[PDB]
Amino acid sequence: EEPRIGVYVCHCGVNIGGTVDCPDVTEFAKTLKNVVVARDYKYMCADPGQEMIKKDIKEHNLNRVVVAACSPRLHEPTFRRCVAEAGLNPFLFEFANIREHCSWVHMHEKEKATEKAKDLVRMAVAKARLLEPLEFIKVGVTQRALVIGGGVAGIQTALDLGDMGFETILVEKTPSVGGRMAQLDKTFPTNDCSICILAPKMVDVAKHPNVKLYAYSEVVDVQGYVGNFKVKIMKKARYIDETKCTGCGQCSEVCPIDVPNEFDMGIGMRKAIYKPFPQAVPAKYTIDKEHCIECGLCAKVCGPNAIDFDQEPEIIEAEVGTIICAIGYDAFDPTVREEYGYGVYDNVVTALELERMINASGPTGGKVIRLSDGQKPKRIAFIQCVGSRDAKVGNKYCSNVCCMYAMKNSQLIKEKSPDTEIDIYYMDIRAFSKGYEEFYERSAKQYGIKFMRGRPSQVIEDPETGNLVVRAEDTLLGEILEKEYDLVVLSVGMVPTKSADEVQKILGISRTPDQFFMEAHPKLRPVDTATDGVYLAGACQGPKDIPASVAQGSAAASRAAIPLAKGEVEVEPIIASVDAEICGGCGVCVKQCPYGAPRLVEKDGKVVAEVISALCKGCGTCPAGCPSGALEQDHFKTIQLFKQIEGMFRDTA
């Protein structure tokens, strides 16, 4: 059928109309073949504009619509539904971007901007003539979810989904769920213990009837698409039959070796037979071979007989419909900031080390001590923004929580030792959520905590006494300060967790400039990804505190429940398919697809390629690589792109 095209140029008030001569573009568009109706309007995405298109589709019997306006990344869904309402197939609509890509970047070259818009319209019409009607592909949804990471965020997502009635798998890398919240003593701004809020959640998640918890396990493979994911979980070997394990801890006492306990950030030392922290869930012990010596000593004192060195990792295969990534974060390693002396000075510590020191269940019994003297420091300095808001370390972002947790641990130190003098060296105090500013006022007024507005230039250790001197300008006085301290705490920032690269490679999701995982839209889809069926929750999506991480966990469960509740979703048909009559089975395409969609088949005696439509994401790499042209990606055919290139220079007549 011969193309009948409606072309719509948008002024966007004066965003486009101020630079691009839209009436002139409109007139030029009517010179191109098959353009039946062309008009300029001030707001095309406004209801009068949409009603103008749909109404022309019926009155003028159009089979194609071109809209020269903003980016398809904003309104392509808007205008696709607009045309669909008028009976026109949504893939007979083509978007020309004359704002972001023309009027807004050529404001001082209007004549050339108008001429550029004309070429961008002609390139749009050119591809529009050869567009084809497509149909969305419906697929079923497996009624099960997968949560990766068992911090507050992931736990919250599993409990919400499980409470909704959806089967849920929760995979935790370490022997215990709980995450970094488990490492904290108290939590701002209520100053509850972290255990107050987290531990009941850890208990509920372990015995939930709809949640299968795989602790000491990791996802090792994910294949498929929304509603149809096939995942492989490596359930690592603890070397203790958990079913028989009691968690009494008698075995740990006999162990003859010591191991740096990672849960205590390398401060406290554990046995090779261990349980991360006294409230760990599952309350089961684990043997670490990296140091195990196999003298049987542990097994001798165990009644049940749970210890067993013949254990081997088991791989589990599970169907899931949706995945939520909630793998948390790591503390910044402040070694690279040489001026502060972390890793060099004994009494320079990170804040996350301080949490393990101040925590009652901690290696020091909740006692803040200098790691050189063993004595309690009577003067303490907090240094803010360590590894954050710093281009020299490649972290130009704000880590969100370090202002509050520094004031938090200052309140707690003051409670355990009112005589302690505490100075916080800061640039901005960012106490931005409910009760935070009040928490900030309370830290100074009630707890007498001192705030120095001045980012320290260096920390000078006294080699003889282990004492530290902090050089910084009191910017609010215009004077240089050189105060001495018994202990300096570096308020390190948040950075992606070490295994984030592995998880990203498996789920196939993107990252923002700050190296955290990228949400689908920074405003309206904070827990969705651009990969359908994959969602985010917690600090792995960006630096944030516990209330935000919990709300995201519940938000990600609502989003991930929409496909599960619907039981069906639609996938875009901008996919690749083989023309059997052109393909002589050369085999070039097979290895090009990272999802294994193209396959060599034997029908009618001959070999022919064949694309499993469900496995194609629509990249279009292997059609570009097909030497016979049998392979084409709908909506991005070679002939369609050829017309678009010609349209830059001439009408496709």
């Binding site: 070039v588 097979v590 090009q592 070999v607 690589g625």
Partner: protein, 149 residues
């Protein structure tokens, strides 16, 4: 053009029917065996190097063979006779620039088994005559059909 094909085209027009050429690429007619896992090319060989195995696809052995980018119809006598296809029959109806498509395919599968690490400059450096490798019979019909001077 083979003699039978000339006969079919003309007799069709004598009868009044439209002639129709074969549409698939050459691997159809060719009797050489491919890998069902797909084409992967580790290194590139000039046709005088090594000893080509008589039954394995020459492209997977590392020889620039134009069968993949060439229309069927001839019977694939060159690969049957022990040499790569030179592409003399030209592209299929769905390819305009035969050499461009052959280059696209060749580059896509070169080092594909080691996709993210194979150095992308090995392939241009191993081919000394590129236009002659990919545009033997079709250069005047390529998008760029001349060398500028």
């Amino acid at each position: 053009p083979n003699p039978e094909m000339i006969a079919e085209v003309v007799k069709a027009l004598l009868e009044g029917k439209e002639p129709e050429l074969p549409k698939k690429n050459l691997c159809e007619e060719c009797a050489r065996k491919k890998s069902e896992e797909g084409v992967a090319i580790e290194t590139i060989k000039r046709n005088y190097e090594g000893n080509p195995d008589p039954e394995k696809c020459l492209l997977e052995q590392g020889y620039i063979c134009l069968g993949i980018a060439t229309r069927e119809g001839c019977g694939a006598p060159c690969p049957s006779s022990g040499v790569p296809c030179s592409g003399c029959s030209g592209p299929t109806d769905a390819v305009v620039d035969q050499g461009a498509k052959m280059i696209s395919a060749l580059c896509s599968d070169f080092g594909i088994d080691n996709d993210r690490d194979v150095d992308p400059m090995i392939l241009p450096k191993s081919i000394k005559d590129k236009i002659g490798s990919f545009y033997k019979f079709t250069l005047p019909s390529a998008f760029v059909p001349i060398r500028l001077k």
